[PDB]
PDB file of C-alpha atoms in Angstrom:
ATOM      1  CA  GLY A   1     -53.894  -0.825  19.120  1.00  0.00           C
ATOM      2  CA  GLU A   2     -57.245   0.444  18.206  1.00  0.00           C
ATOM      3  CA  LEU A   3     -60.264  -1.927  19.379  1.00  0.00           C
ATOM      4  CA  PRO A   4     -60.657  -1.802  23.004  1.00  0.00           C
ATOM      5  CA  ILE A   5     -60.034  -5.275  24.719  1.00  0.00           C
ATOM      6  CA  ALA A   6     -62.838  -5.304  27.337  1.00  0.00           C
ATOM      7  CA  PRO A   7     -65.596  -5.413  24.739  1.00  0.00           C
ATOM      8  CA  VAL A   8     -64.245  -8.370  22.860  1.00  0.00           C
ATOM      9  CA  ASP A   9     -63.584 -10.046  26.230  1.00  0.00           C
ATOM     10  CA  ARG A  10     -67.240  -9.825  26.966  1.00  0.00           C
ATOM     11  CA  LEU A  11     -68.095 -11.135  23.417  1.00  0.00           C
ATOM     12  CA  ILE A  12     -65.914 -14.448  24.414  1.00  0.00           C
ATOM     13  CA  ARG A  13     -68.186 -14.670  27.675  1.00  0.00           C
ATOM     14  CA  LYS A  14     -71.157 -14.139  25.618  1.00  0.00           C
ATOM     15  CA  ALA A  15     -70.167 -17.101  23.272  1.00  0.00           C
ATOM     16  CA  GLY A  16     -70.116 -19.163  26.353  1.00  0.00           C
ATOM     17  CA  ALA A  17     -66.902 -18.782  28.161  1.00  0.00           C
ATOM     18  CA  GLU A  18     -66.898 -18.693  32.024  1.00  0.00           C
ATOM     19  CA  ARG A  19     -63.468 -17.143  32.216  1.00  0.00           C
ATOM     20  CA  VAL A  20     -61.325 -15.448  29.583  1.00  0.00           C
ATOM     21  CA  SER A  21     -57.660 -14.763  29.845  1.00  0.00           C
ATOM     22  CA  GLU A  22     -56.373 -11.369  29.445  1.00  0.00           C
ATOM     23  CA  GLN A  23     -54.267 -12.267  26.607  1.00  0.00           C
ATOM     24  CA  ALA A  24     -56.909 -14.273  24.751  1.00  0.00           C
ATOM     25  CA  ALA A  25     -59.008 -11.090  24.549  1.00  0.00           C
ATOM     26  CA  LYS A  26     -56.183  -9.000  23.289  1.00  0.00           C
ATOM     27  CA  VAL A  27     -55.235 -11.579  20.574  1.00  0.00           C
ATOM     28  CA  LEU A  28     -58.775 -11.807  19.402  1.00  0.00           C
ATOM     29  CA  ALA A  29     -58.982  -8.146  19.392  1.00  0.00           C
ATOM     30  CA  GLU A  30     -55.745  -7.633  17.714  1.00  0.00           C
ATOM     31  CA  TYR A  31     -56.851 -10.203  15.056  1.00  0.00           C
ATOM     32  CA  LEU A  32     -60.190  -8.414  14.530  1.00  0.00           C
ATOM     33  CA  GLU A  33     -58.225  -5.207  14.024  1.00  0.00           C
ATOM     34  CA  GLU A  34     -56.229  -6.614  11.062  1.00  0.00           C
ATOM     35  CA  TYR A  35     -59.377  -8.358   9.714  1.00  0.00           C
ATOM     36  CA  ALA A  36     -61.005  -4.970   9.866  1.00  0.00           C
ATOM     37  CA  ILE A  37     -58.105  -3.272   8.071  1.00  0.00           C
ATOM     38  CA  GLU A  38     -58.170  -6.187   5.375  1.00  0.00           C
ATOM     39  CA  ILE A  39     -61.960  -5.330   4.720  1.00  0.00           C
ATOM     40  CA  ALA A  40     -61.344  -1.824   4.965  1.00  0.00           C
ATOM     41  CA  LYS A  41     -58.812  -1.858   2.078  1.00  0.00           C
ATOM     42  CA  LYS A  42     -61.182  -3.256  -0.391  1.00  0.00           C
ATOM     43  CA  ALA A  43     -63.805  -0.994   0.817  1.00  0.00           C
ATOM     44  CA  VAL A  44     -61.413   2.025   0.218  1.00  0.00           C
ATOM     45  CA  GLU A  45     -60.957   0.584  -3.303  1.00  0.00           C
ATOM     46  CA  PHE A  46     -64.666   0.660  -4.093  1.00  0.00           C
ATOM     47  CA  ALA A  47     -64.808   4.153  -3.109  1.00  0.00           C
ATOM     48  CA  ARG A  48     -61.836   5.531  -5.179  1.00  0.00           C
ATOM     49  CA  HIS A  49     -62.955   3.480  -8.313  1.00  0.00           C
ATOM     50  CA  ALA A  50     -66.576   5.504  -7.767  1.00  0.00           C
ATOM     51  CA  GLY A  51     -64.519   8.603  -7.696  1.00  0.00           C
ATOM     52  CA  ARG A  52     -65.539   8.909  -4.060  1.00  0.00           C
ATOM     53  CA  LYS A  53     -63.290   9.926  -0.902  1.00  0.00           C
ATOM     54  CA  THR A  54     -66.133   8.766   1.312  1.00  0.00           C
ATOM     55  CA  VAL A  55     -66.502   5.161   2.189  1.00  0.00           C
ATOM     56  CA  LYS A  56     -70.237   4.396   2.345  1.00  0.00           C
ATOM     57  CA  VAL A  57     -72.255   1.398   3.624  1.00  0.00           C
ATOM     58  CA  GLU A  58     -72.304  -0.179  -0.024  1.00  0.00           C
ATOM     59  CA  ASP A  59     -68.542  -0.342  -0.021  1.00  0.00           C
ATOM     60  CA  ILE A  60     -68.241  -1.954   3.368  1.00  0.00           C
ATOM     61  CA  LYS A  61     -70.865  -4.509   2.619  1.00  0.00           C
ATOM     62  CA  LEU A  62     -69.071  -5.563  -0.527  1.00  0.00           C
ATOM     63  CA  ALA A  63     -65.984  -5.852   1.198  1.00  0.00           C
ATOM     64  CA  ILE A  64     -67.210  -8.035   3.903  1.00  0.00           C
ATOM     65  CA  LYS A  65     -68.679 -10.159   1.274  1.00  0.00           C
ATOM     66  CA  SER A  66     -65.153 -10.873  -0.594  1.00  0.00           C
TER      67      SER A  66
ATOM     68  CA  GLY B   1     -73.635  -3.576  20.484  1.00  0.00           C
ATOM     69  CA  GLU B   2     -70.489  -4.033  21.923  1.00  0.00           C
ATOM     70  CA  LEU B   3     -67.433  -2.941  19.831  1.00  0.00           C
ATOM     71  CA  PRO B   4     -67.186   0.808  19.684  1.00  0.00           C
ATOM     72  CA  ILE B   5     -67.829   2.436  16.149  1.00  0.00           C
ATOM     73  CA  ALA B   6     -65.159   5.144  16.710  1.00  0.00           C
ATOM     74  CA  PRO B   7     -62.142   2.791  16.736  1.00  0.00           C
ATOM     75  CA  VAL B   8     -63.620   0.898  13.626  1.00  0.00           C
ATOM     76  CA  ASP B   9     -64.061   4.322  11.847  1.00  0.00           C
ATOM     77  CA  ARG B  10     -60.478   5.018  12.419  1.00  0.00           C
ATOM     78  CA  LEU B  11     -59.208   1.625  11.095  1.00  0.00           C
ATOM     79  CA  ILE B  12     -61.110   2.495   7.887  1.00  0.00           C
ATOM     80  CA  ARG B  13     -59.161   5.773   7.754  1.00  0.00           C
ATOM     81  CA  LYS B  14     -55.780   4.069   8.450  1.00  0.00           C
ATOM     82  CA  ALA B  15     -56.620   1.774   5.690  1.00  0.00           C
ATOM     83  CA  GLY B  16     -56.745   4.971   3.155  1.00  0.00           C
ATOM     84  CA  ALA B  17     -60.046   6.362   3.755  1.00  0.00           C
ATOM     85  CA  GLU B  18     -60.381  10.241   3.803  1.00  0.00           C
ATOM     86  CA  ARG B  19     -63.818  10.254   5.068  1.00  0.00           C
ATOM     87  CA  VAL B  20     -66.152   7.568   6.389  1.00  0.00           C
ATOM     88  CA  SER B  21     -69.916   7.636   6.797  1.00  0.00           C
ATOM     89  CA  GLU B  22     -70.992   7.047  10.463  1.00  0.00           C
ATOM     90  CA  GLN B  23     -73.325   4.283   9.023  1.00  0.00           C
ATOM     91  CA  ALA B  24     -70.359   2.598   7.146  1.00  0.00           C
ATOM     92  CA  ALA B  25     -68.295   2.515  10.345  1.00  0.00           C
ATOM     93  CA  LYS B  26     -71.251   1.051  12.228  1.00  0.00           C
ATOM     94  CA  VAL B  27     -72.079  -1.615   9.803  1.00  0.00           C
ATOM     95  CA  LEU B  28     -68.147  -2.865   9.840  1.00  0.00           C
ATOM     96  CA  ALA B  29     -68.331  -2.873  13.653  1.00  0.00           C
ATOM     97  CA  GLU B  30     -71.399  -4.918  13.921  1.00  0.00           C
ATOM     98  CA  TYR B  31     -70.010  -7.358  11.337  1.00  0.00           C
ATOM     99  CA  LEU B  32     -66.899  -7.615  13.271  1.00  0.00           C
ATOM    100  CA  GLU B  33     -69.080  -8.375  16.373  1.00  0.00           C
ATOM    101  CA  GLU B  34     -70.839 -11.061  14.628  1.00  0.00           C
ATOM    102  CA  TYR B  35     -67.593 -12.569  13.490  1.00  0.00           C
ATOM    103  CA  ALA B  36     -65.713 -12.319  16.683  1.00  0.00           C
ATOM    104  CA  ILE B  37     -68.701 -14.320  18.439  1.00  0.00           C
ATOM    105  CA  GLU B  38     -68.515 -17.030  15.762  1.00  0.00           C
ATOM    106  CA  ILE B  39     -64.897 -17.388  16.412  1.00  0.00           C
ATOM    107  CA  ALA B  40     -65.343 -17.275  20.302  1.00  0.00           C
ATOM    108  CA  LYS B  41     -67.817 -20.039  20.084  1.00  0.00           C
ATOM    109  CA  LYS B  42     -65.269 -22.241  18.575  1.00  0.00           C
ATOM    110  CA  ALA B  43     -62.918 -21.199  21.213  1.00  0.00           C
ATOM    111  CA  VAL B  44     -65.335 -22.230  23.932  1.00  0.00           C
ATOM    112  CA  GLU B  45     -65.327 -25.547  22.444  1.00  0.00           C
ATOM    113  CA  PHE B  46     -61.806 -26.213  22.508  1.00  0.00           C
ATOM    114  CA  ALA B  47     -61.661 -24.780  26.164  1.00  0.00           C
ATOM    115  CA  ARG B  48     -64.600 -27.121  27.173  1.00  0.00           C
ATOM    116  CA  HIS B  49     -63.041 -30.385  25.635  1.00  0.00           C
ATOM    117  CA  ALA B  50     -59.832 -29.370  27.195  1.00  0.00           C
ATOM    118  CA  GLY B  51     -61.812 -29.464  30.431  1.00  0.00           C
ATOM    119  CA  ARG B  52     -61.138 -25.920  30.885  1.00  0.00           C
ATOM    120  CA  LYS B  53     -63.648 -23.063  31.781  1.00  0.00           C
ATOM    121  CA  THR B  54     -61.075 -20.216  31.071  1.00  0.00           C
ATOM    122  CA  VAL B  55     -60.827 -19.630  27.264  1.00  0.00           C
ATOM    123  CA  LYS B  56     -57.156 -19.040  26.677  1.00  0.00           C
ATOM    124  CA  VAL B  57     -54.599 -17.877  23.832  1.00  0.00           C
ATOM    125  CA  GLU B  58     -54.189 -21.348  22.573  1.00  0.00           C
ATOM    126  CA  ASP B  59     -57.917 -21.527  22.048  1.00  0.00           C
ATOM    127  CA  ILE B  60     -58.390 -18.318  20.080  1.00  0.00           C
ATOM    128  CA  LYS B  61     -55.388 -19.009  18.066  1.00  0.00           C
ATOM    129  CA  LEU B  62     -57.124 -22.219  16.820  1.00  0.00           C
ATOM    130  CA  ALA B  63     -60.707 -20.710  16.508  1.00  0.00           C
ATOM    131  CA  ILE B  64     -59.095 -17.778  14.378  1.00  0.00           C
ATOM    132  CA  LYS B  65     -57.660 -20.319  11.871  1.00  0.00           C
ATOM    133  CA  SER B  66     -60.850 -22.269  11.187  1.00  0.00           C
TER     134      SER B  66
END
């Protein structure tokens, strides 16, 4: 995909996990990827409607808060 | 934090972004980081009550749809 697996695996360990299965980290990472895409889409919409090609912090914030 | 900015930036682009401000990508990456942890904490709980120290796919799947 796009998002590395190792960082997500570590995030699970930071959430309290003693051990994390390879597939568990991959799955979460995959889900985070589609979630990112979902939010990104709204972000791109906010930019296009502003007559902008560049997506800024303001677009992302609004996208996450939807 | 943990998750890299570059991959996130690329996801925004694959969502339709022609240009993405470094900050925009960074903030989305940090939010995804915060979200994964929240999901992960729930995953550790299912695992713990199952008597397991290793977080599995079944745990992540349930934490995601909460």
